[PDB]
Amino acid sequence: RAIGGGLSSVGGGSSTIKY
Numbered sequence: 001r002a003i004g005g006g007l008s009s010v011g012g013g014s015s016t017i018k019y
Contacts, residue, residue, distance in 0.1 A: 007014075
């Protein structure tokens with residue numbers, strides 16, 4: 001669809017904030 005985003009496309013790193 002037009003919402004074809006993808007969390008795996010996120011850059012800068014996710015776990016960098018260390019939950």
